[PDB]
C-alpha cells in the first residue's frame, strides 16, 4: 500500500526560541507542524514519549496526528504534527476581541475541562498529567468558541514553566518536588491567571478592560526569576480585581474562583474538577 507522508507547509503561524509553527497541508487538509530547535529537542521527547504512553484524545486537548523524527546530513529534524485551530491562541484572540458572558463561561469551562481530564487518573485509561507550562499561548481557539489545551512538552505523568504564570512554591523553590499533586497545584495558579486574562475582556455594564498578561503592572517584560519572586513570594501580590466586575453577577463569581486557584498554601487552592461545578453553576 500507499503511504503518503509528504506535508506541504505553506505559511508560518509562530516563531520563537522553540521553533517554529507553520500552517501545513496533508492530503487536503490542514495541520499545524511545530518544527523544533535543536536547542529543545528534549520538548519533543517527552511530548513523543507522553503520546507513545497514552493517546490523549479530549475536545479540550489540541488533537495529536504525529511526531516525526527525519535523519539530515548533519542534523535531526524533529516535527509535532497536530490539528490545526486558524483563530489562534487565545493570547492572541483577546489581543482584539471583547467577549459576552456566554462567550466568557464557555471559553474557560473550556479550558478547565481540558485541565481536568489531564490532571485525572483513569483506571482499566490514562495516567495523571500535570502540564506545567499553562497559559493563554498554549491555549488555541475553535470556531465553535470552546479553547483547547497545547504543548505537553514539559507535561509529567504519574525547560522550565513561563516564568510570569510560576506559582509561589515554584518562585521560592519550597515546591514538594516528589509529590505528584504539587503539580497540578501549580497548573490550577496558572489556571488562575488565564481566568483573569481573559474575564478582563468580558464586556459589564459597557466596561471592559484592555487585554493586559498576569502582573503587567509588577514586573518588566522578560521579567527574571527574582522579579517574580519578589511580587509573588515576598510582597504576596496578586492580580487586580476592578471595582466594574463587582456590578456583574458573572464577573463577580469569576473573581471568587480565581481568588481560590491562588492562594499561597498550594494545597487549599481549588481542584480543576471544583472549579468545573463551579463554572457549570454560573449564570
Ligand atoms: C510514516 O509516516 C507517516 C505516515 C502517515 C500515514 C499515511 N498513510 C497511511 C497511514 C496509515 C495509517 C494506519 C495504517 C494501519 C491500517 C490498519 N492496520 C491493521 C494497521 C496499520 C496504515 C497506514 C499513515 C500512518 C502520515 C504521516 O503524516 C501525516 C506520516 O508522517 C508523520
Ligand atoms: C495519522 O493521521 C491520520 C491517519 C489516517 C489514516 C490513513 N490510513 C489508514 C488509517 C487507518 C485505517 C484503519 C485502521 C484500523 C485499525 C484497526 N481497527 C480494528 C480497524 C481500523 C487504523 C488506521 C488512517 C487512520 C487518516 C487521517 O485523516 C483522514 C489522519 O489524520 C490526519
Ligand atoms: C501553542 O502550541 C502549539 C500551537 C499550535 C497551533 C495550532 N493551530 C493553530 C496555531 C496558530 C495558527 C494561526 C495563528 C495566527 C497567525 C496567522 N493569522 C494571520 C492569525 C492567526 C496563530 C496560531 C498554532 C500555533 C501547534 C502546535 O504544535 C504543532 C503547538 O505546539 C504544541
Given at each position: 500500500?500507499?503511504?503518503?507522508?509528504?506535508?506541504?507547509?505553506?505559511?508560518?503561524?509562530?516563531?520563537?526560541?522553540?521553533?517554529?509553527?507553520?500552517?501545513?497541508?496533508?492530503?487536503?487538509?490542514?495541520?499545524?507542524?511545530?518544527?523544533?530547535?535543536?536547542?529543545?529537542?528534549?520538548?519533543?521527547?517527552?511530548?513523543?514519549?507522553?503520546?507513545?504512553?497514552?493517546?490523549?484524545?479530549?475536545?479540550?486537548?489540541?488533537?495529536?496526528?504525529?511526531?516525526?523524527?527525519?535523519?539530515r546530513h548533519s542534523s535531526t529534524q524533529?516535527?509535532?504534527?497536530?490539528?490545526?485551530?486558524?483563530?489562534?491562541?487565545?493570547?492572541?484572540?483577546?489581543?482584539?476581541?471583547?467577549?459576552?458572558?456566554?462567550?466568557?463561561?464557555?471559553?474557560?469551562?473550556?479550558?478547565?475541562?481540558?485541565?481536568?481530564?489531564?490532571?485525572?487518573?483513569?483506571?482499566?485509561?490514562?495516567?495523571?498529567?500535570?502540564?506545567?507550562?499553562?497559559?493563554?499561548?498554549?491555549?488555541?481557539?475553535?470556531?465553535?468558541?470552546?479553547?483547547?489545551?497545547?504543548?505537553?512538552?514539559?507535561?509529567?505523568?504519574?525547560?522550565?514553566?513561563?516564568?510570569?504564570?510560576?506559582?509561589?512554591?515554584?518562585?521560592?523553590?519550597?515546591?514538594?518536588?516528589?509529590?505528584?499533586?504539587?503539580?497540578?497545584?501549580?497548573?490550577?495558579?496558572?489556571?488562575?491567571?488565564?481566568?483573569?486574562?481573559?474575564?478582563?475582556?468580558?464586556?459589564?455594564?459597557?466596561?471592559?478592560?484592555?487585554?493586559?498578561?498576569?502582573?503587567?503592572?509588577?514586573?518588566?517584560?522578560?521579567?527574571?526569576?527574582?522579579?517574580?519572586?519578589?511580587?509573588?513570594?515576598?510582597?504576596?501580590?496578586?492580580?487586580?480585581?476592578?471595582?466594574?466586575?463587582?456590578?456583574?453577577?458573572?464577573?463577580?463569581?469569576?473573581?471568587?474562583?480565581?481568588?481560590?486557584?491562588?492562594?499561597?498554601?498550594?494545597?487549599?487552592?481549588?481542584?480543576?474538577?471544583?472549579?468545573?461545578?463551579?463554572?457549570?453553576?454560573?449564570?
Open positions: 500500500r500507499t503511504v503518503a507522508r509528504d506535508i506541504t507547509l505553506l505559511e508560518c503561524v509562530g516563531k520563537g526560541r522553540y521553533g517554529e509553527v507553520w500552517r501545513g497541508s496533508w492530503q487536503g487538509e490542514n495541520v499545524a507542524v511545530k518544527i523544533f530547535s535543536s536547542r529543545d529537542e528534549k520538548s519533543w521527547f517527552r511530548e513523543t514519549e507522553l503520546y507513545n504512553t497514552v493517546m490523549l484524545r479530549h475536545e479540550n486537548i489540541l488533537g495529536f496526528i504525529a511526531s516525526d523524527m527525519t535523519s524533529l516535527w509535532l504534527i497536530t490539528h490545526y485551530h486558524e483563530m489562534g491562541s487565545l493570547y492572541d484572540y483577546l489581543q482584539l476581541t471583547t467577549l459576552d458572558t456566554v462567550s466568557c463561561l464557555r471559553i474557560v469551562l473550556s479550558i478547565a475541562s481540558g485541565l481536568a481530564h489531564l490532571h485525572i487518573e483513569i483506571f482499566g485509561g490514562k495516567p495523571a498529567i500535570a502540564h506545567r507550562d499553562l497559559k493563554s499561548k498554549n491555549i488555541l481557539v475553535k470556531k465553535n468558541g470552546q479553547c483547547c489545551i497545547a504543548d505537553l512538552g514539559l507535561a509529567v505523568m504519574h525547560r522550565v514553566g513561563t516564568k510570569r504564570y510560576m506559582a509561589p512554591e515554584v518562585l521560592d523553590e519550597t515546591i514538594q518536588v516528589d509529590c505528584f499533586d504539587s503539580y497540578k497545584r501549580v497548573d490550577i495558579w496558572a489556571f488562575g491567571l488565564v481566568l483573569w486574562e481573559v474575564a478582563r475582556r468580558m464586556v459589564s455594564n459597557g466596561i471592559v478592560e484592555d487585554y493586559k498578561p498576569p502582573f503587567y503592572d509588577v514586573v518588566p517584560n522578560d521579567p527574571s526569576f527574582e522579579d517574580m519572586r519578589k511580587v509573588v513570594c515576598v510582597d504576596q501580590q496578586r492580580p487586580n480585581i476592578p471595582n466594574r466586575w463587582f456590578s456583574d453577577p458573572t464577573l463577580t463569581s469569576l473573581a471568587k474562583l480565581m481568588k481560590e486557584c491562588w492562594y499561597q498554601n498550594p494545597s487549599a487552592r481549588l481542584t480543576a474538577l471544583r472549579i468545573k461545578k463551579t463554572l457549570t453553576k454560573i449564570d
